A paper describes a structure:
In contrast, the eukaryotic NCX has evolved an allosteric Ca2+ regulatory element encoded by a large cytosolic domain (∼500 amino acids) between transmembrane helices 5 and 6 i.e. the repeated membrane motif, designated as f-loop. This large loop includes two Ca2+-binding regulatory domains (CBD1 and CBD2), connected by a short linker. High-resolution NMR and crystal structures of isolated CBD1 and CBD2 domains of eukaryotic NCX revealed four Ca2+ sites (Ca1-Ca4) on CBD1 and two Ca2+ sites (CaI-CaII) on CBD2. Different lines of evidence suggest that CBD2 interacts with CBD1 to modify the equilibrium and kinetic properties of the primary Ca2+ sensor (Ca3-Ca4 sites), either in isolated CBD12 or in intact NCX.
To test this working hypothesis, we crystallized and determined the crystal structure of a two-domain CBD12 tandem from the brain splice variant (NCX1.4). In order to crystallize the tandem, we employed a previously characterized mutant, E454K. (i) The E454K substitution replaces the Ca2+ ion at Ca1 site of CBD1, thus, stabilizing the protein’s structure through a charge compensation mechanism. The overall structure of CBD12-E454K shows two nearly identical CBD domains, each composed of an anti-parallel β-sandwich, with root mean square deviation (r.m.s.d for 109 Cα atoms) of 1.3 Å. In agreement with the previously published crystal structure of CBD1-E454K, our structure reveals three Ca2+ ions in CBD1 that correspond to Ca2, Ca3 and Ca4 in CBD1-WT. Notably, there is no indication for bound Ca2+ ions in CBD2 of our structure. We ascribe the lack of bound Ca2+ in CBD2 to crystal packing between symmetry mates. The interface involves mainly interactions of the CBD1 Ca2+ binding loops with the interdomain linker, the CBD2 flexible FG loop and the strictly conserved CBD2 BC loop. The first hydrophilic region includes a pivotal interdomain electrostatic network centered at R532 in CBD2. This arginine takes a conformation that forms bifurcated hydrogen-bonded and non-hydrogen-bonded salt-bridges with D499, D500 in CBD1 and D565 in CBD2.
Author numbering: 372 to 468, 482 to 599, 619 to 652
The structure:
């Protein structure tokens, strides 16, 4: 009798390649032979660009309340904001081999989350404490908001009350190479033991501007939003390293 959409709202990723939506019959009749016509309407997302066209008929054989439809999701590499498109149910039968009914929701809203932000690069903490022991130390550099593309993130150590050159820490410079879909990377810095106490030895580890490696009204804002999917620095671009002393014994 009543036949409608499981979830009034769906969501997916642009690279999902496709998105499954489920339809149901509530009751008011048993079985069998009910089929529902579905089709996609455009929201802020358009067919042929953000997704694929999607119309067909769904057949209900006996003893079943669950059928799924699948809409193709078009993927490219151009950063976009979130966009939506609708899927409508219509023309219920009426086997004749009845009357209505629509049911609710007869339409679903699919949200396509984009996966082309080159990422925001940041340290996890503004300050870290480490003992003189432990020699080398691992420092994670994060890529958030997106993993798309090969990004190069430069870094270096800045001498504080703690001196480098082989006194307190061993100077380190270079650039981390973030592969596509890759998120985390560690920086190794050599902390050495002093025959000497001193106090609160502080030195810094900084990351520079990231950059990626080589190889109409709507279209304009579309290309402007695209320029916002480039690699940028995050909340913490500089790490202060405090060194704890002792414990002799
Ligand atoms: Ca898209
Ligand atoms: Ca994409
Ligand atoms: Ca895209």
């Amino acid at each position: 009798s009543k036949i409608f959409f499981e979830q009034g709202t769906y969501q997916c990723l642009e690279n999902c390649g496709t998105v499954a939506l489920t339809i149901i019959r509530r009751g008011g009749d048993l079985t069998n032979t009910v089929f529902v016509d579905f089709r996609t309407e455009d929201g802020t997302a358009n067919a042929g660009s953000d997704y694929e066209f999607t119309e067909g008929t769904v057949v209900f054989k006996p003893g079943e309340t669950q059928k799924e439809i699948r809409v193709g999701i078009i993927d490219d590499d151009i950063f976009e904001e979130d966009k939506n498109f609708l899927v409508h149910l219509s023309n219920v039968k009426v086997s004749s081999e009845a009357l209505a009914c629509l049911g609710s929701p007869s339409t679903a809203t699919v949200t396509i989350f984009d996966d082309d932000h080159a990422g925001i690069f940041t340290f996890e903490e503004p300050v870290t404490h480490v003992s003189e022991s432990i020699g080398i130390m691992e420092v994670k550099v994060l890529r958030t908001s997106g993993a798309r593309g090969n990004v190069i993130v430069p870094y270096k150590t800045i001498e504080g009350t703690a001196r480098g050159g082989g006194e307190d820490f061993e100077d380190t410079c270079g650039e981390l190479e973030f592969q596509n879909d890759e998120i985390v990377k560690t920086i190794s810095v050599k902390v050495i033991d002093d025959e000497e106490y001193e106090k609160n030895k502080t030195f810094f580890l900084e990351i520079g501007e990231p950059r990626l490696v080589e190889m109409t009204s709507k279209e304009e804002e579309e290309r402007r939003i695209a320029e916002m999917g480039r690699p940028i620095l995050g909340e913490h671009t500089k790490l202060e390293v405090i060194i704890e002393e002792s414990y002799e014994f």
